[PDB]
Each structure stands twice: as C-alpha cells, then as structure tokens.
C-alpha cells in the first residue's frame, strides 16, 4: 500500500468485492442476510444518531455479516499471498 | 611461556535469528563480555539467553552481558562439543581484558606459578572471636 | 471554660519552638 508494509495487496479486493455476491443470496427466511442488514442499517437509524437499542435484529445481522466479511478477507489474503498454498 | 591472546574483531558470529534476551543498556554504560571459540563444523547449540544458534565452521564470536553467561556457554561447549574458548571483558571506552583461561591453563588444573590469594593457614574454627575484633569494619575471616 | 483561640495559637507557637529545638538535636545527632 501507499503506507505501512501491509501485505493486503490491491489485487486482493476480490475479498470484499466478492463476499457480498454470496451473502446477498436469499436464505428462504426473510429476504437475504445482506439485504436484511442493509434494511436494518437504513431503518433503525443511520447507525449514528440514537442507537440500535439493546440486542436488536440489527446487532446480530451486523455481527454475522462482519464475521463473514472479515473471515473472507483474511483467508483470501493468506491464500493469495501464499501462492497456491506454497507453505 | 603464555601471553593473553588478543581479541580479533573480524571473527564472525554464530547464525542466530535474534532474541529479546540479549544485551540491554548496561553494556553501553558499564561493560559486556565476549566469548570466542573454534569449531570444526557448523552445528546447532543452545544459547544461554534462550533459543538455538548455529556455530559456523571455524572461528566464532559471541557477545553476552554477564560473565556467567559466557562461562555457561563455555561449559556447554566443553562438555558437549569438546571445544575450548576464550572469554574477554569489553568496556564502553574500548578496553579488552582477558578472563577465564588467565594463564592458558584451566583453573581446575594446577599450573605452578599462580597467586595463592585468599588462603588462610588455620582451621575454620581457629578464627578470632567476634568480640575481639569489635568496632572494626572486618569479619573474623579477614584476620 | 473552654480554651480560647489565643491559647491554641500560643500552644502552636510553643510547639514551633520545640520543633526547632528538635531539628537542632537531629542535626547534631547526624554529625
């Protein structure tokens, strides 16, 4: 990157630009994980004014979506920098 | 006919990846020690500061903090690889002082020509009574 | 008849003098 020595390569954007392509798939119930997360984000306040109360649907949706996104980001970075898992 | 061998600064150091148990700030303002030995092959040894290093084939130099660390490494080399080493004391100003093999002969072996320092010619119970040396900054063993 | 403020002030001043004597004795003992 421009600063640091972060191994997060620019070509590795597929992590965060591909995880939504799979998290947007409907899961029968409700409409979709990302869809529900975005709807909650845009409805239960713009995650800045008041608050998501105590233990709301938005909390679990945000935690699950971020869990998947972070795991995909880190695992993909490891795999891409490992070059076909050469370690 | 023995003279203290001079310390060569061109001696390479053993292959080590680094550790947090090495020299600190005391070596910059007080002193540190250097142990130099000769190995017939490149082999893995245990360092007194933690971890494992690889001594090269030929001359090896290692800088440690205390003299006890150097002596422990020398003991390991003598009892494991049958390698003899030399220990020196280096000061920040740049003075090197020979140590351990003082007269080229190990202390456990009599050399006939050393100083018989601190050797009382009496028994342990033949020392002066503490009441007989009162008001004197000395213990009964120094009489 | 409770002790008045002037009595407390006098006692404090006498204590100050006593403390001065004490510090002098301590200095003499240090030597």
């Amino acid at each position: 990157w421009g600063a640091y020595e972060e191994p997060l390569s620019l070509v590795a954007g597929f992590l965060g630009w591909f995880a939504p392509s799979n998290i947007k798939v409907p899961a029968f119930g409700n409409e979709s994980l990302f869809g529900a997360f975005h709807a909650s984000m845009l409805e239960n306040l713009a995650n800045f004014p008041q608050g998501p109360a105590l233990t709301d649907k938005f909390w679990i949706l945000m935690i699950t979506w971020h869990l998947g996104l972070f795991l995909a980001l880190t695992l993909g970075n490891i795999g891409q920098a490992a070059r076909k898992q050469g370690y | 006919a023995f003279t203290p061998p001079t310390l060569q600064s061109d001696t390479p150091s053993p292959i080590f990846g680094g550790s947090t148990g090495g020299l600190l700030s005391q070596a910059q303002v007080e002193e540190f020690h250097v142990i130099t030995w000769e190995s017939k092959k490149e082999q893995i040894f245990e360092m007194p500061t933690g971890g494992a290093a690889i001594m090269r084939q030929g001359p090896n130099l290692l800088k440690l903090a205390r003299k006890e660390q150097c002596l422990a490494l020398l003991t390991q080399l003598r009892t494991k690889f049958k390698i003899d080493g030399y220990i020196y004391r280096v000061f920040p100003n740049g003075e090197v002082q020979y140590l351990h093999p003082k007269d080229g002969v190990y202390p456990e072996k009599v050399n006939a020509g050393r100083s018989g320092d601190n050797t009382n010619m009496r028994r342990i119970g033949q020392n002066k009574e503490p009441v007989q040396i009162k008001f004197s900054g000395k213990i009964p063993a120094e009489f | 008849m409770p002790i008045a403020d002037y009595q407390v002030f006098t006692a404090l001043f006498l204590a100050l003098a006593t403390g001065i004597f004490a510090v002098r004795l301590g200095v003499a003992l240090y030597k």
């Binding site: - | 390479p12 150091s13 540190f32 280096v90 | -």
Partner: protein, 94 residues
C-alpha cells in the same frame, strides 16, 4: 559494528556493537512557527531555574491550604457543613 557479513563486534566501532541507536530520534529544526515559538519561550523565560520552577509548585501547596480554609467551604463539603441531631448509644450513655 561493520556488520557487512556476520561480524557484530568491532573494537574500532564499539559504539555500534552495543546497540546505542536512537531508533526513532530525528534532528530537524524546521517545524514550530517562529511567532508561536517565541511566545512560549518568552512565557517560560525565568521559569527554567530549579528554584523558580519549584516556586510555581509552591503555589499549588498554597492552593491546597486555600481549599481547606475556603475552597472546601465553597463547594459545600460535608465535613465543613453542619450536623443534624445525634444518638444516645448502647446503654445510658452519650
């Protein structure tokens, strides 16, 4: 240290063989604005002496005594406030 190879000891460069490095220090005299720097060095003019800087600390000691004799009463501290009734005790005491 002459660490061009595997030598980390050098009597002619003993300064580098003991790890005497600044690590993060950097000398640079171009940073603070001249007008603001002058104001601060001027404000802390004579306050650079041990006796004078201790005098500033002595002011804090006076403030401590001032609080007890005035500040504590102005903040309505419970110890400096009044007291309401009392109790008798276990038996016929006070």
């Amino acid at each position: 240290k002459y660490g061009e190879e595997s030598r980390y000891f050098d009597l002619k460069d003993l300064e580098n063989t003991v790890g005497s490095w600044d690590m993060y220090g950097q000398e640079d005299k171009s940073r603070y604005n001249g007008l603001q720097s002058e104001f601060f060095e001027r404000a802390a003019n004579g306050l650079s002496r041990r006796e004078y800087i201790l005098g500033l600390v002595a002011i804090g000691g006076a403030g401590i005594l001032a609080w007890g004799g005035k500040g504590a009463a102005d903040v309505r501290l419970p110890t400096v406030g009044p007291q309401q009734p009392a109790q008798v005790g276990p038996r016929g005491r006070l």
